[PDB]
Amino acid sequence: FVLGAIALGRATAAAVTAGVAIAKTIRLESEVTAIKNALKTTNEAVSTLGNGVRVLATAVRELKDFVSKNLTRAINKNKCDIDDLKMAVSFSQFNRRFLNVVRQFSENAGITPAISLDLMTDAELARAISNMPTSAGQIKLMLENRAMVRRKGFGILIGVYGSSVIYMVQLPIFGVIDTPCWIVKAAPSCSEKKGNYACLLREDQGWYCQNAGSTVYYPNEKDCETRGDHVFCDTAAGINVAEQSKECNINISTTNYPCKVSTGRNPISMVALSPLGALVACYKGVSCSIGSNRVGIIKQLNKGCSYITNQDADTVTIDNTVYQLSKVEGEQHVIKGRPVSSSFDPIKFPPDQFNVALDQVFENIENSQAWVRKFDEILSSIEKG
Amino acid sequence: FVLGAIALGRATAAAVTAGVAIAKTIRLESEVTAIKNALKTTNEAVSTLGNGVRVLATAVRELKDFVSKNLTRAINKNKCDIDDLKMAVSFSQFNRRFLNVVRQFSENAGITPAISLDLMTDAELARAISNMPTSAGQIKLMLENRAMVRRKGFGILIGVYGSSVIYMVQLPIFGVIDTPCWIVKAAPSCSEKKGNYACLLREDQGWYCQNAGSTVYYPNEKDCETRGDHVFCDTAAGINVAEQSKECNINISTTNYPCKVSTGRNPISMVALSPLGALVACYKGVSCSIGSNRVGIIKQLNKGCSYITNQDADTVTIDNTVYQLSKVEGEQHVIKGRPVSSSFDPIKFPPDQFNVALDQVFENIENSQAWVRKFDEILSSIEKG
Amino acid sequence: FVLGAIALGRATAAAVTAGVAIAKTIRLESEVTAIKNALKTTNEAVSTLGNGVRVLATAVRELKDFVSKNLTRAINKNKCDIDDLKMAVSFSQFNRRFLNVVRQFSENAGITPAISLDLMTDAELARAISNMPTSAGQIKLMLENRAMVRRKGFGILIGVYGSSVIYMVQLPIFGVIDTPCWIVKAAPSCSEKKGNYACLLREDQGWYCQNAGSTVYYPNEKDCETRGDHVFCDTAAGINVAEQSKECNINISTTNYPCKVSTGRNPISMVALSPLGALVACYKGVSCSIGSNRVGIIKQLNKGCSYITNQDADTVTIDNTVYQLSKVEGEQHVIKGRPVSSSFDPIKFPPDQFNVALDQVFENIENSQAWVRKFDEILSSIEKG
Amino acid sequence: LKESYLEESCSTITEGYLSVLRTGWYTNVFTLEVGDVENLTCSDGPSLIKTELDLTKSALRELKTVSADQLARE
Amino acid sequence: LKESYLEESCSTITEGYLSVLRTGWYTNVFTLEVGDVENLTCSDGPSLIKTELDLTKSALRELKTVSADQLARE
Amino acid sequence: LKESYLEESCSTITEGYLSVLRTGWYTNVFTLEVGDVENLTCSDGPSLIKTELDLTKSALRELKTVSADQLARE
Ligand SMILES: *[C@@H]1O[C@H](CO)[C@@H](O[C@@H]2O[C@H](CO)[C@@H](O[C@@H]3O[C@H](CO)[C@@H](O)[C@H](O)[C@@H]3O)[C@H](O)[C@H]2NC(C)=O)[C@H](O)[C@H]1NC(C)=O
Ligand SMILES: *[C@@H]1O[C@H](CO)[C@@H](O[C@@H]2O[C@H](CO)[C@@H](O[C@@H]3O[C@H](CO)[C@@H](O)[C@H](O)[C@@H]3O)[C@H](O)[C@H]2NC(C)=O)[C@H](O)[C@H]1NC(C)=O
Ligand SMILES: *[C@@H]1O[C@H](CO)[C@@H](O[C@@H]2O[C@H](CO)[C@@H](O[C@@H]3O[C@H](CO)[C@@H](O)[C@H](O)[C@@H]3O)[C@H](O)[C@H]2NC(C)=O)[C@H](O)[C@H]1NC(C)=O
Ligand SMILES: *[C@@H]1O[C@H](CO)[C@@H](O[C@@H]2O[C@H](CO)[C@@H](O)[C@H](O)[C@H]2NC(C)=O)[C@H](O)[C@H]1NC(C)=O
Numbered sequence A, B, C: 001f002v003l004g005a006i007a008l009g010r011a012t013a014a015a016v017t018a019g020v021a022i023a024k025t026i027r028l029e030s031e032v033t034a035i036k037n038a039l040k041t042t043n044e045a046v047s048t049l050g051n052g053v054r055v056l057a058t059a060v061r062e063l064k065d066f067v068s069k070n071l072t073r074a075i076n077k078n079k080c081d082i083d084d085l086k087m088a089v090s091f092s093q094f095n096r097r098f099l100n101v102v103r104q105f106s107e108n109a110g111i112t113p114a115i116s117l118d119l120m121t122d123a124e125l126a127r128a129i130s131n132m133p134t135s136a137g138q139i140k141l142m143l144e145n146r147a148m149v150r151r152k153g154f155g156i157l158i159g160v161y162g163s164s165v166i167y168m169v170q171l172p173i174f175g176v177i178d179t180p181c182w183i184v185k186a187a188p189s190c191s192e193k194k195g196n197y198a199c200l201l202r203e204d205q206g207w208y209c210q211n212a213g214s215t216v217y218y219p220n221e222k223d224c225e226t227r228g229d230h231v232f233c234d235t236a237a238g239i240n241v242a243e244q245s246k247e248c249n250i251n252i253s254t255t256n257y258p259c260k261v262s263t264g265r266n267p268i269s270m271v272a273l274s275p276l277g278a279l280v281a282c283y284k285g286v287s288c289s290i291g292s293n294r295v296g297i298i299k300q301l302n303k304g305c306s307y308i309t310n311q312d313a314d315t316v317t318i319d320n321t322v323y324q325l326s327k328v329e330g331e332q333h334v335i336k337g338r339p340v341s342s343s344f345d346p347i348k349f350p351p352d353q354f355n356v357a358l359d360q361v362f363e364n365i366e367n368s369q370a371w372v373r374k375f376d377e378i379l380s381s382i383e384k385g
Numbered sequence D, E, F: 001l002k003e004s005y006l007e008e009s010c011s012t013i014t015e016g017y018l019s020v021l022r023t024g025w026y027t028n029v030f031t032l033e034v035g036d037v038e039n040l041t042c043s044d045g046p047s048l049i050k051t052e053l054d055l056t057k058s059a060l061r062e063l064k065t066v067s068a069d070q071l072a073r074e
């Protein structure tokens, strides 16, 4: 069970499926007649559909008013070669929004993947947020960060009923706020005895959240996105994990949870940048060093893994490359221990594995010497016994 | 072999390779002189290149007629401060198509990934489809759905040959229509005996198609896209599979084809939405229930897997999360049986596997038993016998 | 380890991290006052930030001049219904650039993924390139290929400080040019003995480069892009590999480097297009042929894998499909040998494996055979001896 | 925030963030009205109003061949 | 359509679709003519036609450094 | 270029390319000035300058709630 492949497609598939399931209801002729009867005297009205879902209906009448009163009063004898020059310039300002919606639906085949400023302007994005069905403290947060609510929507085309384009816009509701999170990053950890290596690497990386006592795990980091401290996640792309899945960060070797690792026998050298530093893994054939921006080279690292605080350096170099660190304030720590890979004999290490629990590598090795010593005892008792 | 990764890149790589191998012929000086001699009289002519392929040549002359006739006669004394205001506004309407081609080819490095209304308009898209080299039944399908033919093209820049931009547009030919298809979905299938588990999961999920007596399999779901019943597949991203591969849907257990699975030892709880329902796996730590839009919670599910018809519910909940079912109309059937996972002993289950045929999980268990019996027979026969 | 997954995310995450880390310095009120005090008389000056970095500061004053000189004198009585029509057609030509920047930072929530022609025009892209800190050999190459330098930037919003939008643009520096490269492609290699198969596939496919004696390996092919001969790679997405890793192209079996393979027990039939040809794997069920654009079919291929030069054919067919070979001039060579998978026995071939070295598929076969041979001697000496 | 360097497994953990989770969708329905631009004609020849009118009429006539999630047969 | 729930393996199969498969490509070659905008010059100072003329000339000049697949360096 | 068909392993290797590698970033800082559009008002009714001016003022007022970092919750 590779948790990174079970996910990867759930968040997008479950968002289109929930949007086409309600366009199938407004598309009728019973609803469209009922919607446009709420908007005959006002420019906005809240209506309830037939399947119980409530929506917000809003009307646009800038181009219809111009055509009805101004234009259809100078084009009398079918003569449009008039010398006014103000109607012909005003007409090209009013229909600028109409022609920009028609281009977005006609090129995206009826479903656009984002809400441009022509579908939903900024004055109408703050009237939708003020109506959403959620508490008062969530509304206030959304109103000052509207650019992150527009960023996760889409549009769908309903039809052309007479002479009026109808369409709908789906917006997210951020109903749960201020609940703890954290992030885990990893790099290979190798050993060596007389030229043989025994590698190891963690595989439970990504974001974790709490929510009223149940932990969730978002494996594909295209789901989440930070702005400062806050993290903007999508609850349809996570996988519930047990409560004691946080014992992998305290005693990995000797828990009862199945911590997931990937093993090997050939070293890899890499830099894995973390939010407040970087992890540098330097091995046999590679040379590394760190430096600053004003001066330059400061010192050179040793073989193995090491932690480079972002208050020590500004660049980290792997044999020819330069990675710029991130300048974020915080406080670091170091937790002592003896690396797990120091416990393996480099000979008699199992073959390459891919997302197996750490209990099975220890069981695989032990099951092997169980039989060799079983055979050695039966061997003597036959001839000598 | 992991069939989902052998693919994943063939569809887009095989389209650009064929696009650039034909631009390399029109870019000669021998072919451009031949194309521009076809359009000296008309505005469209079907011409054959020098390597046997046939193209369609079309010319755009709205701007050149303004500059030739209307414009370079109001500018005689190199004076452009006239009191006209009709040329100053007309000339800002004629060069809005020209200035929007130059913007798209200059930010995309010369190869745009979609056809806009500025490259190929809508009256020149229904003149291409009327000419394609296919039968009359297929043309009628494309002429009514022109928005799904534009969706899969691109443009490539040939040059600026004097004072005239030349480019090219690649359009798809949907030459095979109305052939059977189907889709497969899956979720984990766990078991238990006094606290230990034995999971299992299918790994052949995606779209299959007949085509004149040959099944194909599209493993990455970015390749196919439904509109109602029809599904718009790409034939360069699929892998031919044997005709017996549909036997996996009748008895996965005792068959002869190699059915692909992935095993485990720790439960996963999730919801996998299918086109006419949902599949809900509830296990040792999660609480599941279903409900409807109007009345709320309806009932609470049991432990294990179960199938939820979209005529019975509207939303499904996994411990905190609400998924919205789809309201497509169809049929449903349930095919009884005893799950495969009930046939395994939770102890003496093989370690975690990734895309192995189910034929080998039974062979792995049976090999290990035979050695124990073989070794045991010796122990009794060296002393007692 | 699986090298294709340790990568896949490094290139984009390192680019954004190094961009926000330097907008955090330009956003101080101490640095914004220093920038705007360099542009008090000129329109471009080179300024050093507070942490030792150098930037290039440039100012845009086309709209401020119109509002200060021309627009304000006409509107003196608050009567902006003047009958001029030149102050109302001009004022819509001057704020097209301002109203397009506000449109791109407001839908992308402050970070845009590419440089448009509104953030940085083309005359200001040849003034940054003339200033970059690199040698004159590289600067000249970047000026005839400016469209490939705009393609890999992005922009970030600093703020609105009074009445002046401030933003910044990141551009790449191509500091190393003309250093050798190559590319590797693969296809399955199967064999039969009385109906049983023994597959095999390579896993080190992608781009490799040299750099002053050190080889790098770019596993994900969304990173590199060819234009002619040159390859545009990103140095932050590669993995330093040993110099012996070019012995897998000379001797794959008897070498001592760990060459990665994936195995199986069921054939696959596919076509893998290479730069100057194609590799066609035709097995037990599929029928293949090659053709031309003029003279139709040419011949029918045999079973096993074969190499098709792009001077013999223009199309290759797999049972119903057509693939277009690339038309590029080069040289073709054939290196004789006997395939590796003809040395295996289809019985006692190990189960499916995913990215394991080829030294271990030979050990797995040897270890299981040693126990069988050992076990038959012990039985004899019990009684026969 | 606060970052720990777990030495035993060679990894790190950064705590101190806060969450903002999506829990549903809200729907807005628009009705963009165009008027009676299908009855107005031009009979003088080229001009600015005629070009704008042709553009608007053609946009309406084009938006009727696009379907969100159904095909068109018969 | 029609959907079966296969209990034995906990999966489900939906049948009843129809296919629309791509089988080739078609090429349309355009020719966006512009005219003689290189022999038009202005001398009266700022105006509207001058701005539009300069925009058109600059676009033509900058389109000659873009290549589909070849490096212009040489 | 030059392509070898490696028969033993069933693969191919193509040699003869040249590399163009990125090694750093360069930062350009802009400053797009707008003037004093906040001090100009309109007291007639609908016209063209009024529409343009209202667009410009609204764009300034809108851009001040967009952040590339540090959510504005305060
Ligand atoms: C299209 O035609 C209508 C009339 O058929 C024009 O209506 C004009 O509307 C404005 C304001 O809506 C009015 O002019 C002035 O309005 C201000 C504030 O409302 C008022 O204080 C003044 O006394 C004056 O009434 C008036 O209703 C009308 N203007 C007239 C009759 O001169 C409309 O202007 C036309 N469209 C365009 C684009 O001009
Ligand atoms: C650019 O080209 C010529 C300028 O030489 C303009 O052609 C002029 O426009 C039309 C099209 O032929 C003609 O209008 C006339 O209208 C009367 C109304 O009854 C009708 O009877 C005529 O049959 C004709 O349609 C006009 O005579 C014609 N002038 C000439 C000398 O041919 C064209 O309009 C210009 N375009 C611009 C400035 O945008
Ligand atoms: C905004 O207002 C300013 C001044 O009020 C306008 O500048 C004026 O336009 C040009 C540019 O300097 C000058 O034109 C003149 O043309 C004659 C032609 O022979 C030439 O002899 C002069 O040397 C000059 O080039 C004009 O003098 C200039 N006025 C001043 C006082 O400098 C500007 O055009 C206005 N903005 C717009 C968009 O029109
Ligand atoms: C264009 O005008 C025609 C009349 O010349 C309209 O046709 C009639 O419109 C009235 C409403 O104004 C309806 O009650 C009639 O049923 C219509 N008759 C027919 C035969 O259609 C037509 O609706 C106008 N077009 C538009 C787009 O409004």
Ligand SMILES: *[C@@H]1O[C@H](CO)[C@@H](O[C@@H]2O[C@H](CO)[C@@H](O)[C@H](O)[C@H]2NC(C)=O)[C@H](O)[C@H]1NC(C)=O
Pocket (backbone or CB within 6 Å): B163, E035, E036, E037, E038, E039
């Ligand atoms: C701009 O004008 C020049 C001459 O004033 C044109 O150059 C001549 O073009 C003719 C073709 O019409 C050729 O026969 C001559 O040999 C050209 N002369 C020279 C010196 O080259 C030029 O073609 C005009 N520009 C455009 C775009 O037509």
Ligand SMILES: *[C@@H]1O[C@H](CO)[C@@H](O[C@@H]2O[C@H](CO)[C@@H](O)[C@H](O)[C@H]2NC(C)=O)[C@H](O)[C@H]1NC(C)=O
Pocket (backbone or CB within 6 Å): C163, F036, F038, F039
């Ligand atoms: C709009 O005009 C007002 C004056 O009516 C400006 O307010 C004053 O601006 C000057 C700058 O020249 C300051 O020295 C004064 O302290 C301002 N007065 C007050 C009470 O604040 C205002 O700055 C103008 N708006 C803009 C955007 O410049």
